[PDB]
Amino acid sequence: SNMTIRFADKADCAAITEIYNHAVLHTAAIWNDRTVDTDNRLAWYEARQLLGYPVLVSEENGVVTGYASFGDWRSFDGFRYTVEHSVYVHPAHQGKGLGRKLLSRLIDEARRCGKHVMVAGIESQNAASIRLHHSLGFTVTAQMPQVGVKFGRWLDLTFMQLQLDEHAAPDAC
Amino acid sequence: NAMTIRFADKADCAAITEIYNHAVLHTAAIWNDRTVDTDNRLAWYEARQLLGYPVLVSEENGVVTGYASFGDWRSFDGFRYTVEHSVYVHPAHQGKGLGRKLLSRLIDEARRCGKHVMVAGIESQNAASIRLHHSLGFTVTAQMPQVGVKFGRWLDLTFMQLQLDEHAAPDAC
Ligand SMILES: CC(=O)SCCNC(=O)CCNC(=O)[C@H](O)C(C)(C)COP(=O)(O)OP(=O)(O)OC[C@H]1O[C@@H](n2cnc3c(N)ncnc32)[C@H](O)[C@@H]1OP(=O)(O)O
Ligand SMILES: CC(=O)SCCNC(=O)CCNC(=O)[C@H](O)C(C)(C)COP(=O)(O)OP(=O)(O)OC[C@H]1O[C@@H](n2cnc3c(N)ncnc32)[C@H](O)[C@@H]1OP(=O)(O)O
Ligand SMILES: [Cl-]
Ligand SMILES: [Cl-]
Ligand SMILES: [Cl-]
Ligand SMILES: [Cl-]
Numbered sequence: 196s197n198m199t200i201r202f203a204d205k206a207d208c209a210a211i212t213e214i215y216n217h218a219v220l221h222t223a224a225i226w227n228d229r230t231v232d233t234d235n236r237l238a239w240y241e242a243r244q245l246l247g248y249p250v251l252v253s254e255e256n257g258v259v260t261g262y263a264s265f266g267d268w269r270s271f272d273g274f275r276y277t278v279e280h281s282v283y284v285h286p287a288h289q290g291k292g293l294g295r296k297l298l299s300r301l302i303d304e305a306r307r308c309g310k311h312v313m314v315a316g317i318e319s320q321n322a323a324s325i326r327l328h329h330s331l332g333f334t335v336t337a338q339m340p341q342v343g344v345k346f347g348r349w350l351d352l353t354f355m356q357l358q359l360d361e362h363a364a365p366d367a368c
Numbered sequence: 369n370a371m372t373i374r375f376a377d378k379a380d381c382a383a384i385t386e387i388y389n390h391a392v393l394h395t396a397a398i399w400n401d402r403t404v405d406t407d408n409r410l411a412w413y414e415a416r417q418l419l420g421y422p423v424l425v426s427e428e429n430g431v432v433t434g435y436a437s438f439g440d441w442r443s444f445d446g447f448r449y450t451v452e453h454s455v456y457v458h459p460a461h462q463g464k465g466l467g468r469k470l471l472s473r474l475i476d477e478a479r480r481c482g483k484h485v486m487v488a489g490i491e492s493q494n495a496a497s498i499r500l501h502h503s504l505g506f507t508v509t510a511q512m513p514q515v516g517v518k519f520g521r522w523l524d525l526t527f528m529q530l531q532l533d534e535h536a537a538p539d540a541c
Contacts, residue, residue, distance in 0.1 A: 225444075225446075226442075226444050226445065226446025226447060227444040227445045227446055228445050228446075229445065268515070269399075271398075271399050271400040272399070272400045272401050272402070273399025273400055273401075273516040273517055273518050273523065274399055274515065274516055275517070276517060277515045277516070311514060311522075312514055312515050314512075314515065336510055336511060336512045336513070337509055337510030337511075337512065337527055338509060338510075339487075339509045339510065339527065339529060340485075340509070340529075340531065341484060341485060341531060342441070342447070342450045342485050342487065342529070343446045343447060343450070344446055344448065344449055344538045345446050347537060347538065348537055348538075349484070349537065349538065350446065354510060354512060356512060356513075356515070358513065358514060364514075364517045364520055364521050364522045365517060366520065367401070
C-alpha cells in the first residue's frame with residue numbers, strides 16, 4: 196500500500212535525527228546550532244512516550260519522509276493544557292502536502308490527549324510554515340522582533356496558536 | 369536614604385523566598401503551585417550569578433521590600449541575546465513606585481550584559497505590571513488567550529518587550 200502517516204517506532208530515530216540535524220544546519224526553524232546523535236533523539240522520543248505524547252512519521256515504501264510531534268510548552272503546572280509542536284519534512288520531500296498531512300493528524304492527537312492550545316513558534320520569514328498553519332486554523336497571536344539570532348543575523352518570532360476546544364478551565368486535579 | 373535599590377546578597381534569599389512563595393500562592397504571575405525553600409532560591413541566585421546576571425532588591429530601613437532579576441528566555445543558543453525578567457514587590461509594599469525603580473535599574477543591567485531584548489511574560493489581567501512596563505517603554509508583542517490555567521480560570525498571556533539597542537546584527541558572537 197501507498198504514503199502513510201503513522202506513529203513513530205524507536206527504529207525511526209536515526210531517520211528523525213537526520214531530518215532534525217538538517218534543520219539545525221540549514222534552516223532558521225530551530226534556534227540552536229547543536230547537531231545531535233541518534234541517542235539524543237531516542238531520549239526525546241522516549242520522553243514523549245512517557246507523557247503519552249505522539250511522535251508521528253510520514254513514510255513512503257518504508258522510508259521516513261518527515262516527522263511531527265508536540266511537548267509541553269513549559270514545564271510549569273499552569274501550562275499543562277498547552278503544547279508546543281513541531282513539524283519537519285525531509286528537504287527532498289517538501290512542498291508535497293506532507294506537512295499538512297502530519298499537522299492535521301497531530302491536531303487530532305492533541306485533541307485526543309486532552310490539550311486546550313497548540314502553540315507554533317515560527318521564524319517570521321518562514322512563509323511555508325505560516326501558510327501551513329493558517330490553512331489548518333491557526334492564528335497569529337505574536338510578532339516579536341529580533342528575539343533570536345542565527346547565521347549572524349537577528350530573527351523575528353511569530354507565535355501562532357490553535358485553541359482545540361471551548362471548555363471551562365479544569366480543576367487542580 | 370530610607371529607601372534603596374541594590375544588588376541582592378545571599379543574606380536576602382530568605383526574604384526573596386517568601387515574596388516568591390506569596391506570589392505562587394496568591395497571584396497568576398507564576399504559573400505553578402510549587403512553593404520553594406531558601407536553599408532553592410539560594411541556588412537560583414547563585415546560578416544567575418554564574419552567568420553574570422543580576423539579582424536586585426528594593427529595601428526600606430533594612431527590610432527587603434521587593435526583588436527583580438532576569439535569565440535566559442530559553443536555553444537554546446539562538447536566544448542568547450534575549451532575556452526574560454521578573455519583578456516582585458512584597459505584598460505590603462506595592463503601589464508606591466518600587467516596581468518601576470526595580471525594573472528601571474534592571475534595564476540598566478540588561479544593557480550592561482549586552483542583551484538586545486527583554487521579554488516580560490505577563491498574565492493579561494495584571495494591569496499593574498502592564499502599566500509599569502508601558503511606563504518604561506515596553507510594547508505589547510503578543511496576546512495569547514487561554515495558554516495557562518490557575519485558580520479555576522484560563523490565563524491569557526501578554527508578551528511585552530523592550531529592545532535595548534539598535535545594533536543591525538548581533539555583535540558578540
Ligand atoms: C511550528 C513549526 O514546526 S515551525 C517549523 C516548521 N519546520 C521547518 O520550517 C523546517 C523546514 N520546513 C519543512 O520541513 C516544511 O517545509 C514545513 C513543515 C514548513 C511545511 O511542510 P511541507 O510538507 O513543505 O508543506 P505542504 O507541502 O504541506 O504545504 C503547506 C503550505 O505551504 C505553502 N507553501 C509552500 N511553499 C511556500 C512558500 N515558499 N511560500 C509560501 N507558501 C508556501 C503551500 O502552498 C501550502 O499551503 P496550503 O496548506 O494552504 O495548501
Ligand atoms: C514580567 C513581570 O515580572 S510580570 C509579574 C510581575 N509580578 C507580579 O505580578 C507579582 C505581584 N505583583 C507585584 O509584585 C507588583 O504589583 C508589581 C511588581 C506588578 C508592581 O509593583 P508596584 O511597586 O506596585 O508598582 P508601581 O508602584 O511602580 O506601579 C506600577 C504601575 O501600576 C499602577 N498600579 C499599581 N497597582 C495597581 C493596581 N492594583 N491596578 C492597576 N494599576 C496599578 C501604578 O499607577 C503604576 O502605573 P502608572 O505608571 O501608569 O502610574
Ligand atoms: Cl492570523
Ligand atoms: Cl468545545
Ligand atoms: Cl498565605
Ligand atoms: Cl488567592
